[PDB]
Every structure is written in C-alpha cells, then in structure tokens.
Design a protein around this ligand. Sequence first.
Ligand SMILES: CC(C)C[C@H](N)C(=O)O
Length: 247
Amino acid sequence: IDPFTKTSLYESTLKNQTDLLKVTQSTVEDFRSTNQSFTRALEKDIANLPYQSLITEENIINNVGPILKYYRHSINALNVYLGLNNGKVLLSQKSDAKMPELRDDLDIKTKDWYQEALKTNDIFVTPAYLDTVLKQYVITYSKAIYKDGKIIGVLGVDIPSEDLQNLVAKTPGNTFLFDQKNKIFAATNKELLNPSIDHSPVLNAYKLNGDNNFFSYKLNNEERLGACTKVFAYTACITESADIINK
Ligand SMILES: CC(C)C[C@H](N)C(=O)O
C-alpha cells in the first residue's frame, strides 16, 4: 500500500471513530444534564412553597408529596424523595399507586446521597448502586433544598442505571463505557459486558495517549485502533480492527 493511501485511510478512520466516540460522550452528558435540570426544577417548586407548608410533617406529606409524585411520573423515575434532619424521608416510589409515605426506617443519614448533598451547593450525582427501596441499580441525583437560607431537607431522584446503559448501547460504533472503578458499565456490543474480559490493553493505551488521542494495540496478534476520553468519572472508548488501514 502506497504511504499516501495508507495515510488517507488512517486519517479518514480516525475522524470517523472520533466522531462516534463523541456521540457516546454526548449521550452520557445529555443524560446527566436532563436529570440535573429536572432535579433543579423540583428543588425550585419545593422551595417556593410557604414555610407553613414545609414545617410540619403532615404538611410535608400533603404539600410536597404530590409534587414528588408528579415529577416522578413525568420522567418515569424509580423513586423521588425528600429526606429530613429528623431521619424521616418522604418517599414517592414506583409501584399500587399508594400516596407518598413518610418513612422512618431507611437510615438516611448513613447514605452518601444525603451526606454529600450537605457538603456541596451543587447537585450531587452518585455512582450506580443498589437502591434499598426497590432493589434496582440506580444513579441518584441529590440536592440540599434551602428556603431563605434554611435547610428544608435533601431531595433525591433515583434513575435506573439501565436507562443510561441502554442509551449508550444504542449508539453507533463499537463504543463502551467504564465506571469510576474501571469496570465495564455499558457497551454497544453486549459481549464486552462479560466480567472476565480483560480491558488492560485498551485502558493502558488510553493511560499513555490521553483523551481523544487515537492509538494502536494488539488482540490475538492482530492490530486494532481506538481512543478513549473521560466523561465525568466514566471512561468512554471506541475500538475497531486496523484492517481498514492495513488491507
Ligand atoms: C429513600 C432512599 C433510602 C433511597 C435510596 N435509593 C437509597 O437506597 O439510599
């Protein structure tokens, strides 16, 4: 292959694969920002209630509860809730259409979504974890809600992590996402989810090359091409065979 031609093929495929990597990055970004906007809107609607509606538990149930429910329905969230400093949490949960209940048994001050919300003025986004209420893996968005400077409680919104997984999987390209512990999280090719697959070659090549920088690596003595980039605490990657440049 004339070097001119090989370079043309390499430049083309780098552009192609870069573009697809960016689509997967965008998917992750847009998922987060939609959920943040939602959480912010809910914060605002709660905080705009008069204090009278907020300062007794029965009023929280009757005035906040409907808001949690409507918001939960509007986005098909798994759980939407407001945790109070007395350790109770007003919980709107998926599934029997019973009204939101004020639960005293959920150990909320032990939870990262609660604690961490009180240490930042931003929305806090958890890693994926197993929700204690409905026993599904969720990503939680939490926010300490204040009215005229006084804490009301900590809002939480649980979105199934499978929702993000499914969005990533639908994207074009052989793209995939690792979580903060560098464990595979999502992939267009579901086979990459096998927990016994070794991802060191890709992850090592990423470590050397940095975000969005295309690299070459080997699999079973054949050349492949790829790139990764950080997206929040996740690492998004794309790989392909190098046959496009070599053959
Ligand atoms: C209402 C909260 C206790 C729910 C949250 N998903 C957790 O498991 O901590």
